[PDB]
Design a protein around this ligand. Structure first.
Ligand code: ATP
Ligand code: ATP
Ligand code: MG
Ligand code: MG
Lengths: 743, 58
């Protein structure tokens, strides 16, 4: 019953939008049985409610072709109601509708152009002659005729707003024509249906802001005081301001908007006076809603504040929100993406006591957001918004809008060959062919990245699983450890075992740890955050802990996310080993890291991968159960793994057939992957030297080397060296033995 | 507040949110806060127990 207020009950007034076969602007048709169920007569005036607080008036008609559950409308009254096909609207008998004494109309500016004669005489007068048409203020209606059919807006009605246009009624088009852009903006108005992925949040908001203002008697009688302070908090782009616009458009209560920094004024005492004026004007027009966007701009913690005017403003806000109880129906809703920066006293009982977390949407929520954003675009048939919803692992809704915009921009780019930018006009066929396809959405997904991971983004080489040679068990284990927790958490819950959320890679240098991280970044469908070791450390006291907090928080915001710690031993070194030497900031850093590893719930899919070639100096606490549980030894490759590495490196290279990779694997017993890569690079450089010298010789004689050969590899092998010694290997062997003994 | 407090012998004053008008002078960043704290101190000291004014704080 959490989202019961969202779903609309089946009512006799509730009817599905249907196309009207022959109804004009001022009439609608309903099925006769449903009409009798509604107790309505033919020729009766009817009031149609619509989305975004828009209503229309028509005449009910009986049509057998019309469905019982459907009400038939033409497109004009659909635009008057801001509704479309498939929508549900409520129809009621409009009582005591009177013949209009006088009605003033304003035609649209585009339609009047090219019409030499009078708009009234040619269009309005024959339209309303003996028509007895019901009209409402603000409605837009189209009259056919002349060179071009002309649209009109009924700006003024008498009596207002409902009136019947009798012949004696005077309709006149004098005045300023209404811009088409104004009508477009009015129709394209943000409503509750423009919000996706926040069904529970919308439920809470409707329960807190719309229900008390519509029906305060219920809250009075049940015995409770309706909530007064509501605070929307969440990551940037999640839709707090969107929710505020939807509420402002779809609420009958007076809406007052306070932009935070706009409170300040140069005159002494004018800022808190502006706050007072806002609350007083809300009280004058009650029921009222006061929206404060960027609440942290004017409401920081008073203890941290070094300005007297800012502290006085926080105190004024506290006083006004306390006195809000005396105010009859004023409700204060605030939005901020830094809820922790808000003054704590403002979050107490009686003031901003309700908090709504506009979080990151899930797959279905992202699908709803994509459906909302793509409703106006001209999608092709091949598009599949479900796939796009599944790909965008860390998108919040602004990112999805960016994705749709980029897909449409790619669609427009595909026609830049046919249309030049310097061209003055475009053929209509080019517009007719223009459409967004699934390839454009796939290009957008390739370019798309979460907005949160815009500072941690790094250029990663295109490493693929087939680029890595050997390590097949490690590859399979990593693929499972990434896919299983996100895809099937229900099995882990059923068996009662939480998936491992921490992996450490340890091994000799050059054996494939960072390469595995690159492959994970390129291949897995999870957001990847790669940070260098000492990237977080800062000289200013308290900043390194804040950096750890920020990186872990933006890892959570992009879940499922992989947080890779290259050279972990810089980030996490043994506590007490260097405690005496230094200020002690590294110990605070590692303690903060431990706190963040412990703080994660299993529901957030933030996989933490650490890489180090010195596991012996890793802090013992980091490896304890619950944090970096899975410890993986990336070893020195063996003969089959060396064959795989040599094939993977030479996969894109022209290599002679007689070049035997098996013997190279045999002879390079102690070599690592980096050593084999160095051998191949040295052979490539020898081939390049031979080709360059051959070209120089040919130029000299005037005034080759199709592929790498066996002699090139033979020459490169004598320069080859084993990078990792036996003692180094023994070090990881002792680490593994001690770790097994501990476990 | 204090003056129409002493004007009535059995009068009483209640200061809700004392920390707001009385922050610790050791850690405060404004002149007006220190002035208001010290002014409250002087008002408290001005009482000679003959006014019989009782001041509670929260
Ligand atoms: N749930 C959603 N459904 C539909 N569109 C959404 C949703 N969330 C965000 N958007 C779109 O993304 C943008 C969100 O901007 P908005 O001002 O609402 O965000 P915000 O939460 O106030 O962010 P910030 O904290 O940066 O102020 C808008 O263009 C809006 O159309
Ligand atoms: N299994 C492998 N298959 C293919 N190439 C490999 C493999 N292992 C290592 N290499 C190559 O050898 C080099 C090893 O670099 P890599 O980033 O993998 O090392 P690392 O294990 O992270 O070591 P370090 O401790 O020195 O940072 C790279 O050039 C990489 O392309
Ligand atoms: Mg906003
Ligand atoms: Mg490395």
């Amino acid at each position: 019953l959490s989202t019961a207020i969202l779903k609309q009950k089946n009512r006799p007034n509730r009817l599905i939008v249907d196309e009207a076969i022959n109804e004009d602007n001022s009439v609608v048709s309903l099925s006769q049985p449903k009409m009798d169920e509604l107790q309505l007569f033919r020729g009766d005036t009817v009031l149609l409610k619509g989305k975004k607080r828009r209503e229309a008036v028509c005449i009910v008609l009986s049509d057998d072709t019309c469905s019982d559950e459907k009400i038939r409308m033409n497109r004009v009254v659909r635009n008057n109601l801001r509704v479309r096909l498939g929508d549900v609207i409520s129809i009621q008998p409009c009582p005591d509708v009177k013949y209009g004494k006088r009605i003033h109309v304003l035609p649209i500016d585009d339609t009047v152009e090219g019409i030499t004669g009078n708009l009234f005489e040619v269009y309005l007068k024959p339209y309303f002659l003996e028509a007895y048409r019901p009209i409402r203020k603000g409605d837009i209606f189209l009259v056919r005729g002349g060179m071009r059919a002309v649209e009109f807006k009924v700006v003024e009605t008498d009596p207002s707003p409902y009136c019947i246009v009798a012949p004696d009624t005077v309709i006149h088009c004098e005045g300023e024509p209404i811009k088409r852009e104004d009508e477009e903006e009015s129709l394209n108005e943000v409503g509750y249906d423009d919000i996706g992925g926040c069904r529970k949040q919308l439920a809470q908001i409707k329960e807190m802001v719309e229900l008390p203002l519509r029906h305060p008697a219920l809250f009075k009688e049940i015995g409770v005081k309706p909530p007064r302070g509501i605070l929307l908090y969440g990551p940037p782009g999640t839709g707090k301001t969107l929710i505020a616009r939807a509420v402002a458009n779809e609420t009958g209560a007076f809406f007052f908007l306070i932009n935070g920094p706009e409170i300040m004024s140069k005159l002494a005492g004018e800022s808190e006076s502006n706050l007072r004026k806002a609350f007083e004007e809300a009280e004058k027009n009650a029921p009222a809603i006061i929206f404060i966007d960027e609440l942290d701009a004017i409401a920081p913690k008073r203890e941290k504040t070094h300005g007297e005017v800012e502290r006085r403003i926080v105190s004024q806000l506290l006083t006004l929100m306390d006195g809000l109880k005396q105010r009859a129906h004023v409700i204060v809703m605030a939005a901020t993406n830094r809820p922790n920066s808000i003054d704590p006293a403002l979050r107490r009982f009686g003031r901003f006591d309700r908090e709504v977390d506009i979080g990151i949407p899930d797959a279905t929520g992202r699908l709803e957001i994509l459906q909302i954003h793509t409703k106006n675009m001209k999608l092709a048939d091949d598009v599949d918004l479900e796939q796009v919803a599944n790909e965008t692992h860390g998108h919040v809704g602004a990112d999805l809008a960016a994705l749709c915009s980029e897909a449409a921009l790619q669609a427009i780019r595909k026609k830049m060959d046919l249309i030049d930018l310097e061209d003055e006009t475009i053929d209509a066929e080019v517009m007719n062919s223009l459409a967004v396809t699934m390839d454009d959405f796939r290009w957008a997904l390739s370019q798309s990245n979460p907005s949160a991971l815009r500072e941690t983004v790094v250029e990663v080489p295109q490493v693929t699983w087939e680029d890595i040679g050997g390590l097949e068990d490690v590859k399979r284990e990593l693929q499972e450890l990434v896919q299983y927790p996100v895809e099937h958490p229900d099995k882990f819950l059923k068996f009662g075992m939480t998936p491992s959320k921490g992996v450490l890679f340890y091994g000799p240098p050059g054996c494939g740890k960072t390469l595995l991280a690159k492959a994970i970044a390129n291949e897995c469908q999870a957001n990847f955050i790669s940070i260098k070791g000492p990237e977080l450390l800062t000289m200013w006291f308290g900043e390194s802990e804040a950096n750890v907090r920020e990186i872990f928080d933006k890892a959570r915001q992009a879940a499922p996310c992989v947080l890779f710690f290259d050279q972990l031993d810089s980030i996490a070194k043994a506590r007490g080993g260097n405690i005496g030497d230094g200020g002690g900031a590294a110990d605070r850093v590692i303690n903060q890291i431990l706190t963040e590893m412990d703080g994660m719930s299993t529901k957030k899919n933030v996989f933490i991968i650490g890489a180090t070639n010195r596991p012996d100096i890793i802090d013992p606490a980091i490896l304890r159960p619950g944090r970096l549980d899975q410890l993986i030894y990336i070893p020195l490759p063996d003969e089959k793994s060396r064959v795989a590495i040599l094939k993977a490196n030479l996969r894109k290279s022209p290599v002679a057939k007689d070049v035997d990779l098996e013997f190279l694997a045999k002879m390079t017993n102690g070599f690592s992957g980096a050593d084999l890569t160095e051998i191949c690079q040295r052979a490539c450089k020898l081939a390049i030297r031979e080709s360059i010298e051959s070209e120089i010789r040919r130029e000299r004689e005037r005034q080759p080397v199709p592929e790498i050969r066996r002699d090139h590899f033979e020459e490169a092998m004598r320069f080859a060296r084993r990078s990792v010694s036996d003692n180094d290997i023994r070090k990881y062997e002792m680490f593994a033995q001690t770790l097994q003994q501990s476990r």
